[PDB]
């Protein structure tokens, strides 16, 4: 650790090199912190975690029991051991409480005040955080399996919703309309994710074993369909592609299928890069959420691997590690790139924190 400090001081290595090397070392040393904890309020499993984007202080956890918890990661206790208290929570007491499980929760990428929560109740609600009241509501005909808002979009705040229905929905928050409908899929779309690089590109994965990349401008047809074999067909996996996430820079896309395979693709032309990630066990019938690191030498991907968390490499494929601790299958993994932290919400109603321990 001293060598990097000396190199930075002398200017042999630019500060970015020390930053990236130290971040990689810390991510390698991720371990289940016994001291830090997050108070167990959820009565059921955790279907999603999402730390706010602007400063990574507040995290949103949606539970299987329909309870939303706005945890605060700011350590106000001044103690090495401390419990991340729930600053506020929407539970059964609150009238607008999601009756059923809340599948995903995602802050407004522009303003930290508002955040979106979609539930198995057939509804997607936009809450504020000044009063934690449901600012807006959208009701669908099929249970919202996933919902995402473009993080690189300032012109529109379009929300892409994938439900049991095979038609993707696009709704405008500013105009308060659910007008747009994209068609072409055959069954429930389990994962929708905008491309961070290109504003108007949406990647949609379904249980039809296909990943379709669309341009919202052209309301006619889908741009591309990822094929594992590159035409040597037109299918991302042998089962259900229930996990989808772009790489931090948006040049690659990671797809996790029920065939227990994780595949990397070029985001530009959609040909399988053929990275062999091995058997990534995945038996979840619901959309599986996985997160990719940011600002690290090698982009890590954290995939819920049964009841552990498998950390691989996005640009090599080598299985960096398998963090254990959770008693039940891990459901959601959210990575705080600010301090190279990880927070996984398993169905055991626990929010386990994983931190780089170096001594």
């Amino acid at each position: 650790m001293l060598g990097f400090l000396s190199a930075r001081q002398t200017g042999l290595e630019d500060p970015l090199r020390l930053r990236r090397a130290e971040s990689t070392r810390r991510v390698l040393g991720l371990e289940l912190n016994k001291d830090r904890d997050v108070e167990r309020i959820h009565g059921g499993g955790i279907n999603t975690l999402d730390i706010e984007p602007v400063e990574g202080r507040y995290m949103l956890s949606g539970g299987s029991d329909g309870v939303i918890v706005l945890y605060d990661l700011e350590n106000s206790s001044r103690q090495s051991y401390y419990t991340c208290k729930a600053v506020c929570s929407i539970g059964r007491d609150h009238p607008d409480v999601h009756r059923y499980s809340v599948e995903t929760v995602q802050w407004y990428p522009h303003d930290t005040g508002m955040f979106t929560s979609s539930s198995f109740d057939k509804t997607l609600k936009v809450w504020d955080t000044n009063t934690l009241q449901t600012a807006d509501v959208f009701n669908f005909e099929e249970t919202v399996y996933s919902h995402h808002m473009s993080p690189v979009s300032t012109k529109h705040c379009l929300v892409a919703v994938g439900t049991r229905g095979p038609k993707v929905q696009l709704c405008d928050l500013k105009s308060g309309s659910c007008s747009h409908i994209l068609q072409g899929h055959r069954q429930e779309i389990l994962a929708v994710s905008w491309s961070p690089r290109y504003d108007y590109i949406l990647a949609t994965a379904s249980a039809d074993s296909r990943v379709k990349l669309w341009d919202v401008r052209r309301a006619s047809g889908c741009l591309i369909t990822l094929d594992q074999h590159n035409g040597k067909a037109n299918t991302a996996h042998n089962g259900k592609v229930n996990g989808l996430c772009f790489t931090s820079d948006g040049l690659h896309l990671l797809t996790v299928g029920t065939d227990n395979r994780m595949r990397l693709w070029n985001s530009s032309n959609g040909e399988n890069t053929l990275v062999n990630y091995g058997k990534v066990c995945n038996n979840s019938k619901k959309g599986l959420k996985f997160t990719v690191s940011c600002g690290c030498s090698s982009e890590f991907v954290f995939v819920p691997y049964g009841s552990t968390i498998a950390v691989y490499t996005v640009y090599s494929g080598e299985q960096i590690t398998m963090l254990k601790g959770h008693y039940k299958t891990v459901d959601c993994c959210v990575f705080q790139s600010n301090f190279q932290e990880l927070y996984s919400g398993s169905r055991d109603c626990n929010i386990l924190a994983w931190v780089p321990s170096l001594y």
Partner: protein, 150 residues
Amino acid sequence: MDQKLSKLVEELTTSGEPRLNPEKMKELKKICKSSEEQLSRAYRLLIAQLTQEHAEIRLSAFQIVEELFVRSHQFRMLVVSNFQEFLELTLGTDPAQPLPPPREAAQRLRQATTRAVEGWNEKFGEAYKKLALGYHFLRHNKKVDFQDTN
């Protein structure tokens, strides 16, 4: 010394009596107190006995584990390091691995394990929050009734 520890563990686990012999248990405790390596070997032997397909052997091994947990800090560290496998072997949490016969001895083992885990959470939950977590994992997630007779 190691062969003596192995023989004592075997005799204590294969005796089949509902209660451990106090003299052999005192000798075992003295050996576990004489060296930390002997304590770790006793731990490994008890784990290997919990894998046996006999509920009386598992019960006796659990009683030894409980006594060493209450009396030894490093044995507590060892048990916590592998608390998941311990709970699987003693309560039969995994439905694919039911408790071995006889049924009455398996029930007694389950009751004793539940009570011991309860008392361990009561006495050491603040520091040993790990074992505490699993406790609630079986308590609420697994709806294990602590007040149930069986």
